Amino acid sequence: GPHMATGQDRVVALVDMDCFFVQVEQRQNPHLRNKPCAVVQYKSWKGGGIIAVSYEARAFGVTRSMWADDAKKLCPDLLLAQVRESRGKANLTKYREASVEVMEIMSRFAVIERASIDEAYVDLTSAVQERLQKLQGQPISADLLPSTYIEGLPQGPTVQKEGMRKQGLFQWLDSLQIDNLTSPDLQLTVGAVIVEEMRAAIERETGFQCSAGISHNKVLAKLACGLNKPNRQTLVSHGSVPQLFSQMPIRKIRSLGGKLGASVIEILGIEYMGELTQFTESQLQSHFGEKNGSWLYAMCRGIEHDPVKPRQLPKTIGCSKNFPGKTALATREQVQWWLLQLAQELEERLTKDRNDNDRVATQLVVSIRVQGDKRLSSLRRCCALTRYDAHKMSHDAFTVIKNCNTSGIQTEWSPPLTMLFLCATKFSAS
DNA sequence: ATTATGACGCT
DNA sequence: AGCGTCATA
Ligand SMILES: [Ca+2]
Ligand SMILES: [Mn+2]
């Protein structure tokens, strides 16, 4: 009891931009602001595929991975912004550059781990200790947490949402013991103060709104972030975990949304995260392996130790294109033309990366899919990447994959290719 | 005929 | 190394 770790040593936040590609387009085009709108890629096939949706549009049932023509059936007034096309393919440069804007602001506050194009983890443990010493055991005012929800509160002995938020925050702050600098609840609270400041800086300096979660580890921070979107932040305390997890579907936890999570549910005959506490660590290891079992055993108790890695930049730079249905590449020169298109975009991004970040990729990965296959990827081969030249890279890509062709005729390609992928990897300092 | 990515684990 | 899993706009 004295020695049982509680996984409360760190303060971790996850900051996630609201409807990110939509906000990027709304900043650019004021006519889209405060409207049901979505971002789409391509247009010919069923109006294009939606990849981001404003909250106004979500209210009509518009979702990601919906065709625009179908979204227009739910929301006739839906406004659409198209992803840029370059060299015959969608080009995401505008959103990658907006991502860098936000990541650079966050980095002023602390070490961040880039987790996607629109979100990053923050280890706030040191920043919190410093702010605590400035504070001199002075109470934290509700005024410093103007957009913060405390998960699980209010509780016990107003019908409007902002009213409930303040009720919960007051109960939380009323309870706090600001006298103890080592108190995990106090540490989370100060972490939340800092994240309010970070989110205010992001909005001031970019125009973009975001949500955030604050907790003691990455999984809880990610879960917290989702609880009160958009434009709000949520503090999930160690103490809030039993109630939170008691009705939390297992698939909601990061890494459990796929096959492993489905197996936890099936094998154990349970539905909610909290139900995992009734198994021994060895039981969980027996079913799910040493690593997953130990992870699950601690995670269902609110404990996880995965560090926030100090990495602000992506580890790989890749370019890919699908060729679905009848557009599949059936001739050699088709294949070679697109390999060149991909390689030209890759060269452009790599050259920019080398100048910005002082590094060079050393490996080129080539991937394809074949019609009827499998699997998102059918085949993956690597070769050396020694010069940032598209023509060399595309010639090299063709070399490592040309034996995939089962056509006796070398002018034809069989089976037709439904995907091409070029990825640069293994960066070295330059 | 969601598409275009990007990280990490297994063997 | 090559494959598979899981994730995000
Ligand atoms: Ca987001
Ligand atoms: Mn995200």
Coordinates of C-alpha atoms (C1' of nucleotides) and ligand atoms in Angstrom, one line a residue:
Chain A
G1 CA 0.0 0.0 0.0
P2 CA 2.8 2.3 0.8
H3 CA 4.8 1.0 -2.1
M4 CA 2.2 0.6 -4.8
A5 CA 3.0 3.0 -7.7
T6 CA 0.2 5.3 -8.7
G7 CA 1.7 6.6 -12.0
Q8 CA 1.2 10.2 -10.9
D9 CA 4.8 11.4 -11.3
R10 CA 4.3 13.3 -14.6
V11 CA 2.0 15.9 -16.0
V12 CA 1.3 15.2 -19.7
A13 CA -1.0 17.2 -22.1
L14 CA -2.3 16.4 -25.5
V15 CA -3.2 19.4 -27.7
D16 CA -5.3 18.6 -30.8
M17 CA -6.5 21.2 -33.3
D18 CA -10.3 21.3 -33.9
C19 CA -11.3 20.3 -37.4
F20 CA -7.8 21.2 -38.5
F21 CA -7.8 21.3 -42.3
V22 CA -11.2 23.1 -42.2
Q23 CA -9.7 25.8 -39.9
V24 CA -6.8 26.2 -42.2
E25 CA -9.2 26.8 -45.2
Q26 CA -11.5 29.0 -43.1
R27 CA -8.5 31.3 -42.1
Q28 CA -7.7 31.6 -45.8
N29 CA -11.3 32.1 -47.0
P30 CA -13.4 34.2 -44.5
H31 CA -16.5 33.2 -46.5
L32 CA -16.2 29.7 -45.0
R33 CA -16.1 30.8 -41.4
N34 CA -18.9 29.8 -39.0
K35 CA -20.5 27.7 -41.8
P36 CA -21.1 24.0 -42.3
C37 CA -18.1 23.1 -44.4
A38 CA -15.7 20.3 -45.2
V39 CA -12.4 19.7 -46.9
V40 CA -12.5 17.2 -49.8
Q41 CA -10.0 15.6 -52.0
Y42 CA -10.6 15.1 -55.7
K43 CA -14.0 15.7 -57.1
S44 CA -14.9 13.6 -60.1
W45 CA -15.7 10.5 -58.2
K46 CA -18.9 11.2 -56.2
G47 CA -18.0 14.8 -55.5
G48 CA -14.7 13.9 -53.8
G49 CA -13.8 12.3 -50.5
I50 CA -14.3 14.3 -47.3
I51 CA -11.2 14.3 -45.0
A52 CA -12.2 17.1 -42.5
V53 CA -15.6 18.5 -41.2
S54 CA -16.5 21.6 -39.4
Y55 CA -18.6 21.2 -36.2
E56 CA -21.5 23.0 -37.9
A57 CA -21.5 20.3 -40.6
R58 CA -21.1 17.4 -38.1
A59 CA -24.5 18.5 -36.6
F60 CA -26.1 17.4 -39.9
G61 CA -24.2 14.0 -39.7
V62 CA -21.4 14.8 -42.1
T63 CA -18.3 12.7 -41.4
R64 CA -14.9 12.0 -42.6
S65 CA -14.7 9.3 -45.2
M66 CA -18.0 10.2 -46.7
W67 CA -18.3 11.2 -50.4
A68 CA -19.2 14.9 -50.9
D69 CA -22.2 14.0 -53.0
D70 CA -23.6 12.0 -50.0
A71 CA -22.7 14.6 -47.5
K72 CA -24.7 17.1 -49.6
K73 CA -27.7 14.9 -49.2
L74 CA -27.4 15.3 -45.4
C75 CA -26.4 19.0 -45.6
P76 CA -27.5 20.7 -48.9
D77 CA -25.8 24.0 -47.9
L78 CA -22.5 22.3 -47.1
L79 CA -19.6 24.4 -48.3
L80 CA -16.5 22.6 -49.7
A81 CA -12.9 23.5 -49.9
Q82 CA -10.6 21.3 -52.2
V83 CA -7.2 20.0 -51.4
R84 CA -4.7 21.4 -53.8
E85 CA -3.6 19.2 -56.7
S86 CA -0.1 19.1 -58.0
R87 CA 1.4 16.8 -60.6
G88 CA -1.8 14.8 -60.8
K89 CA -2.2 14.2 -57.0
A90 CA -3.4 15.7 -53.8
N91 CA -0.9 17.9 -52.2
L92 CA -1.0 18.5 -48.5
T93 CA 1.7 21.1 -48.2
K94 CA -0.7 23.9 -46.9
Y95 CA -1.7 21.8 -44.0
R96 CA 1.8 20.6 -43.2
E97 CA 3.0 24.2 -43.1
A98 CA 0.1 25.2 -40.8
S99 CA 1.1 22.3 -38.6
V100 CA 4.6 23.6 -38.3
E101 CA 3.1 27.0 -37.2
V102 CA 1.4 25.5 -34.3
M103 CA 4.1 23.1 -33.3
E104 CA 6.6 25.9 -33.1
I105 CA 4.4 27.9 -30.7
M106 CA 3.9 24.8 -28.5
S107 CA 7.6 24.2 -28.4
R108 CA 8.1 27.6 -26.6
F109 CA 6.3 26.2 -23.6
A110 CA 7.9 22.7 -23.5
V111 CA 9.3 19.7 -25.2
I112 CA 6.7 18.3 -27.6
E113 CA 6.2 15.0 -29.3
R114 CA 4.5 15.4 -32.7
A115 CA 1.8 12.7 -32.8
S116 CA 0.1 13.7 -36.0
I117 CA -0.3 16.6 -38.4
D118 CA -2.6 18.3 -35.9
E119 CA -1.6 17.1 -32.4
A120 CA 1.2 16.9 -30.0
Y121 CA 2.0 15.6 -26.6
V122 CA 3.6 18.0 -24.0
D123 CA 5.6 16.9 -20.9
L124 CA 4.7 19.7 -18.5
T125 CA 6.3 18.2 -15.4
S126 CA 9.2 20.7 -15.2
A127 CA 7.2 23.7 -16.3
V128 CA 4.7 22.9 -13.6
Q129 CA 7.4 22.7 -10.9
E130 CA 8.7 26.1 -12.0
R131 CA 5.2 27.7 -12.0
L132 CA 4.5 26.2 -8.6
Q133 CA 7.5 28.1 -7.1
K134 CA 6.4 31.4 -8.7
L135 CA 3.0 30.8 -7.1
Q136 CA 4.2 30.8 -3.5
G137 CA 1.4 28.5 -2.3
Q138 CA -1.0 31.1 -3.6
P139 CA -4.4 29.6 -4.6
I140 CA -5.3 29.0 -8.2
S141 CA -8.2 31.2 -9.3
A142 CA -11.0 29.9 -11.5
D143 CA -10.1 32.9 -13.7
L144 CA -7.0 31.1 -14.8
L145 CA -8.9 28.1 -16.1
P146 CA -11.5 29.7 -18.3
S147 CA -12.1 26.9 -20.7
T148 CA -11.2 23.9 -18.4
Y149 CA -13.5 21.0 -17.5
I150 CA -12.7 18.7 -14.5
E151 CA -13.8 15.2 -15.5
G152 CA -16.2 13.7 -13.0
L153 CA -17.3 17.0 -11.5
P154 CA -19.6 18.4 -10.4
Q155 CA -21.0 15.6 -8.3
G156 CA -23.0 14.9 -5.2
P157 CA -25.3 17.1 -3.0
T158 CA -28.1 25.0 -13.3
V159 CA -29.1 23.3 -16.5
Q160 CA -26.7 25.1 -18.9
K161 CA -23.4 23.7 -20.1
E162 CA -21.0 26.6 -19.1
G163 CA -22.8 26.7 -15.7
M164 CA -22.0 23.0 -15.1
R165 CA -18.4 23.6 -16.2
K166 CA -17.9 26.3 -13.5
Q167 CA -19.7 24.2 -10.8
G168 CA -17.2 21.4 -11.4
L169 CA -14.2 23.7 -11.5
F170 CA -15.3 25.3 -8.2
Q171 CA -15.7 21.9 -6.5
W172 CA -12.2 21.0 -7.7
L173 CA -10.6 24.2 -6.7
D174 CA -12.4 24.3 -3.4
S175 CA -10.9 20.9 -2.6
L176 CA -7.4 21.5 -3.7
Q177 CA -4.5 21.6 -1.2
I178 CA -2.2 24.3 -2.6
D179 CA -0.1 23.9 0.5
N180 CA 1.6 20.8 -1.0
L181 CA 4.0 21.3 -3.9
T182 CA 4.2 17.5 -4.5
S183 CA 0.4 17.0 -4.7
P184 CA -0.5 15.3 -8.1
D185 CA -3.9 17.0 -8.3
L186 CA -2.3 20.4 -7.7
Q187 CA 0.4 19.6 -10.3
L188 CA -2.3 18.7 -12.9
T189 CA -4.1 21.9 -12.1
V190 CA -1.0 24.0 -12.7
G191 CA -0.5 22.0 -15.9
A192 CA -4.0 23.0 -16.9
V193 CA -3.1 26.7 -16.2
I194 CA -0.1 26.4 -18.5
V195 CA -2.2 24.6 -21.3
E196 CA -4.7 27.5 -21.1
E197 CA -1.8 29.8 -21.9
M198 CA -0.5 27.6 -24.7
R199 CA -3.9 27.4 -26.3
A200 CA -4.4 31.1 -26.0
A201 CA -1.0 31.7 -27.7
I202 CA -1.9 29.3 -30.5
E203 CA -5.2 31.1 -31.2
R204 CA -3.7 34.5 -30.9
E205 CA -0.8 33.8 -33.2
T206 CA -2.4 31.6 -35.8
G207 CA -6.2 32.0 -35.6
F208 CA -6.7 28.3 -34.9
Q209 CA -8.6 26.8 -32.0
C210 CA -7.8 23.6 -30.3
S211 CA -8.8 21.3 -27.5
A212 CA -6.5 19.7 -25.0
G213 CA -6.3 17.0 -22.4
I214 CA -4.3 17.1 -19.2
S215 CA -3.4 14.1 -17.2
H216 CA -0.6 12.0 -15.9
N217 CA 0.2 10.1 -19.1
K218 CA -0.4 10.1 -22.8
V219 CA -3.3 7.7 -23.0
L220 CA -5.3 9.6 -20.4
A221 CA -4.3 13.0 -21.9
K222 CA -5.6 11.8 -25.3
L223 CA -8.8 10.5 -23.9
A224 CA -9.3 13.7 -21.8
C225 CA -8.8 15.9 -24.9
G226 CA -11.8 14.2 -26.6
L227 CA -14.2 14.7 -23.7
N228 CA -15.1 18.3 -24.3
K229 CA -14.3 19.3 -27.9
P230 CA -14.2 21.8 -29.5
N231 CA -12.3 24.7 -28.1
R232 CA -12.1 23.4 -24.5
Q233 CA -9.7 21.5 -22.3
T234 CA -10.3 18.7 -19.8
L235 CA -8.4 17.6 -16.7
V236 CA -8.5 13.9 -16.0
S237 CA -7.2 13.2 -12.5
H238 CA -5.9 9.9 -11.2
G239 CA -8.9 9.8 -8.9
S240 CA -11.4 10.2 -11.8
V241 CA -10.2 7.0 -13.5
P242 CA -12.4 4.3 -11.8
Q243 CA -15.6 6.1 -12.6
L244 CA -14.5 7.2 -16.1
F245 CA -13.3 3.7 -16.9
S246 CA -16.4 1.9 -15.5
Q247 CA -18.4 2.6 -18.6
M248 CA -15.6 3.4 -21.1
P249 CA -15.7 1.0 -24.1
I250 CA -12.3 -0.7 -24.5
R251 CA -12.0 0.5 -28.1
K252 CA -11.9 4.1 -27.0
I253 CA -8.4 3.8 -25.5
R254 CA -5.6 4.5 -27.9
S255 CA -4.1 1.3 -29.3
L256 CA -7.2 -0.7 -28.5
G257 CA -9.4 0.4 -31.4
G258 CA -8.4 -2.5 -33.6
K259 CA -7.9 -6.2 -33.5
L260 CA -6.2 -6.3 -30.1
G261 CA -9.1 -4.4 -28.5
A262 CA -11.5 -6.8 -30.2
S263 CA -9.6 -9.7 -28.8
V264 CA -9.6 -8.3 -25.2
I265 CA -13.4 -8.0 -25.4
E266 CA -13.9 -11.4 -27.0
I267 CA -11.5 -13.5 -24.9
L268 CA -12.3 -11.9 -21.6
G269 CA -16.0 -11.5 -22.2
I270 CA -15.9 -7.8 -21.1
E271 CA -17.0 -4.4 -22.5
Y272 CA -15.4 -1.7 -20.4
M273 CA -11.9 -0.7 -19.5
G274 CA -12.7 -0.9 -15.8
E275 CA -13.6 -4.6 -16.0
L276 CA -9.9 -5.3 -16.7
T277 CA -9.0 -4.7 -13.1
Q278 CA -10.3 -8.2 -12.1
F279 CA -7.6 -10.0 -13.9
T280 CA -4.1 -10.7 -12.7
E281 CA -1.1 -9.4 -14.6
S282 CA -0.1 -13.0 -15.5
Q283 CA -3.6 -13.7 -16.8
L284 CA -3.5 -10.7 -19.1
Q285 CA 0.1 -11.6 -20.2
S286 CA -1.1 -15.2 -20.9
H287 CA -3.7 -13.9 -23.4
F288 CA -2.1 -10.9 -24.9
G289 CA 1.6 -11.3 -24.5
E290 CA 4.1 -10.1 -21.9
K291 CA 4.2 -6.5 -23.2
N292 CA 0.5 -6.0 -23.9
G293 CA -0.5 -7.8 -20.7
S294 CA 1.6 -5.6 -18.4
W295 CA 0.4 -2.6 -20.3
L296 CA -3.2 -3.5 -19.9
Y297 CA -2.8 -4.3 -16.2
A298 CA -1.4 -0.9 -15.5
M299 CA -3.6 1.0 -18.0
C300 CA -6.9 -0.1 -16.6
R301 CA -5.7 1.5 -13.3
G302 CA -4.9 4.7 -15.0
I303 CA -1.1 4.1 -15.2
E304 CA 1.0 4.2 -18.3
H305 CA 4.7 5.0 -18.6
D306 CA 5.2 5.7 -22.4
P307 CA 7.4 8.9 -22.5
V308 CA 6.7 12.0 -24.4
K309 CA 9.5 11.7 -27.0
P310 CA 11.3 14.8 -27.8
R311 CA 10.6 14.8 -31.5
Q312 CA 8.9 17.7 -33.3
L313 CA 9.6 16.6 -36.9
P314 CA 8.3 13.6 -38.8
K315 CA 10.8 10.6 -39.1
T316 CA 9.8 9.9 -42.7
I317 CA 8.7 11.9 -45.7
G318 CA 6.4 10.0 -48.1
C319 CA 4.4 10.4 -51.3
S320 CA 1.6 8.0 -52.3
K321 CA -1.2 7.6 -54.7
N322 CA -4.0 5.1 -55.2
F323 CA -5.2 4.1 -58.7
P324 CA -8.6 2.5 -57.8
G325 CA -11.1 0.6 -60.0
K326 CA -10.5 1.1 -63.7
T327 CA -7.7 3.7 -63.3
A328 CA -5.2 1.0 -62.3
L329 CA -1.8 1.3 -64.0
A330 CA -1.7 -1.4 -66.8
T331 CA 1.2 -0.1 -69.0
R332 CA 4.9 0.3 -68.2
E333 CA 5.0 4.0 -69.2
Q334 CA 2.0 4.7 -67.1
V335 CA 3.9 3.2 -64.1
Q336 CA 7.0 5.2 -65.0
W337 CA 5.1 8.5 -65.5
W338 CA 3.5 8.3 -62.0
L339 CA 6.7 7.2 -60.3
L340 CA 8.2 10.4 -61.7
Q341 CA 5.3 12.5 -60.5
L342 CA 5.6 11.0 -57.0
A343 CA 9.4 11.4 -57.1
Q344 CA 9.1 15.0 -58.1
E345 CA 6.9 15.9 -55.1
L346 CA 9.2 13.9 -52.9
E347 CA 12.3 15.7 -54.1
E348 CA 10.5 19.0 -53.5
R349 CA 9.7 18.1 -49.9
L350 CA 13.1 16.6 -49.2
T351 CA 15.0 19.6 -50.5
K352 CA 12.8 21.9 -48.3
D353 CA 13.4 19.5 -45.4
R354 CA 17.2 19.5 -45.8
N355 CA 17.3 23.4 -45.8
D356 CA 14.9 23.7 -42.8
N357 CA 16.0 21.0 -40.5
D358 CA 19.6 20.2 -41.4
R359 CA 19.3 16.5 -42.3
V360 CA 19.3 14.1 -45.2
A361 CA 17.4 10.9 -45.9
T362 CA 19.5 7.9 -46.8
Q363 CA 17.0 5.2 -47.7
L364 CA 14.2 5.2 -50.3
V365 CA 11.3 2.8 -49.7
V366 CA 9.2 1.7 -52.6
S367 CA 5.7 0.2 -52.1
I368 CA 3.0 -1.0 -54.4
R369 CA -0.4 -2.7 -54.3
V370 CA -1.7 -5.1 -56.9
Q371 CA -5.3 -5.5 -58.1
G372 CA -7.1 -8.1 -56.0
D373 CA -4.4 -8.2 -53.3
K374 CA -4.6 -8.3 -49.8
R375 CA -3.8 -5.7 -47.8
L376 CA -3.1 -2.0 -48.1
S377 CA 0.4 -2.9 -49.3
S378 CA 1.3 -5.8 -51.5
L379 CA 5.0 -5.3 -51.6
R380 CA 7.7 -3.2 -50.0
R381 CA 11.3 -2.9 -51.2
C382 CA 14.1 -0.6 -50.1
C383 CA 17.0 0.9 -52.0
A384 CA 19.7 3.5 -51.4
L385 CA 18.8 7.2 -51.5
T386 CA 21.9 9.1 -52.3
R387 CA 20.8 12.1 -54.3
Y388 CA 17.7 14.3 -54.1
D389 CA 16.9 13.8 -57.8
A390 CA 13.4 12.8 -58.9
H391 CA 14.6 11.1 -62.1
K392 CA 17.1 8.9 -60.3
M393 CA 14.7 8.1 -57.5
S394 CA 11.9 7.2 -60.0
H395 CA 14.3 5.1 -62.1
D396 CA 15.5 3.3 -58.9
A397 CA 11.9 2.7 -57.8
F398 CA 11.1 1.1 -61.1
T399 CA 14.2 -1.1 -60.8
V400 CA 13.2 -2.6 -57.5
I401 CA 9.6 -3.3 -58.6
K402 CA 9.8 -4.1 -62.3
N403 CA 10.1 -7.8 -61.5
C404 CA 6.6 -7.6 -60.0
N405 CA 5.3 -7.6 -63.5
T406 CA 4.0 -11.0 -64.5
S407 CA 3.3 -9.9 -68.0
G408 CA 5.1 -11.7 -70.7
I409 CA 4.7 -8.5 -72.6
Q410 CA 7.0 -5.9 -71.0
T411 CA 5.1 -3.0 -72.3
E412 CA 2.1 -4.1 -70.3
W413 CA 1.8 -4.3 -66.6
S414 CA 0.1 -7.3 -64.9
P415 CA -1.6 -7.5 -62.6
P416 CA -2.4 -3.7 -62.8
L417 CA -1.0 -1.5 -60.0
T418 CA -3.6 0.0 -57.7
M419 CA -1.0 1.9 -55.6
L420 CA 2.4 3.6 -55.7
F421 CA 4.3 4.8 -52.7
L422 CA 7.7 6.4 -52.3
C423 CA 9.1 7.1 -48.8
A424 CA 12.3 8.6 -47.7
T425 CA 13.7 7.3 -44.5
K426 CA 16.7 7.0 -42.2
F427 CA 17.7 10.6 -41.8
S428 CA 21.2 11.6 -40.8
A429 CA 22.4 15.0 -39.7
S430 CA 23.7 17.2 -42.5
Chain B
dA1 C1' -13.7 3.9 -55.3
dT2 C1' -11.9 7.0 -48.9
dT3 C1' -7.1 8.7 -49.8
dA4 C1' -2.8 10.3 -48.1
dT5 C1' -0.1 9.8 -45.0
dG6 C1' 3.2 8.4 -40.4
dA7 C1' 4.8 5.6 -36.1
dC8 C1' 5.8 1.4 -34.1
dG9 C1' 5.8 -3.8 -33.2
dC10 C1' 6.9 -8.7 -34.8
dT11 C1' 10.0 -12.1 -36.6
Chain C
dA1 C1' 14.5 -6.4 -43.9
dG2 C1' 9.7 -6.9 -45.0
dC3 C1' 5.2 -7.3 -43.1
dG4 C1' 1.3 -6.0 -40.1
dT5 C1' -1.2 -3.0 -36.8
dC6 C1' -3.1 1.3 -35.5
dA7 C1' -3.6 5.9 -36.0
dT8 C1' -4.9 10.7 -38.0
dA9 C1' -6.7 14.9 -41.6
Ligands
CA1 CA -8.0 17.6 -34.6
MN2 MN -5.8 14.7 -34.2

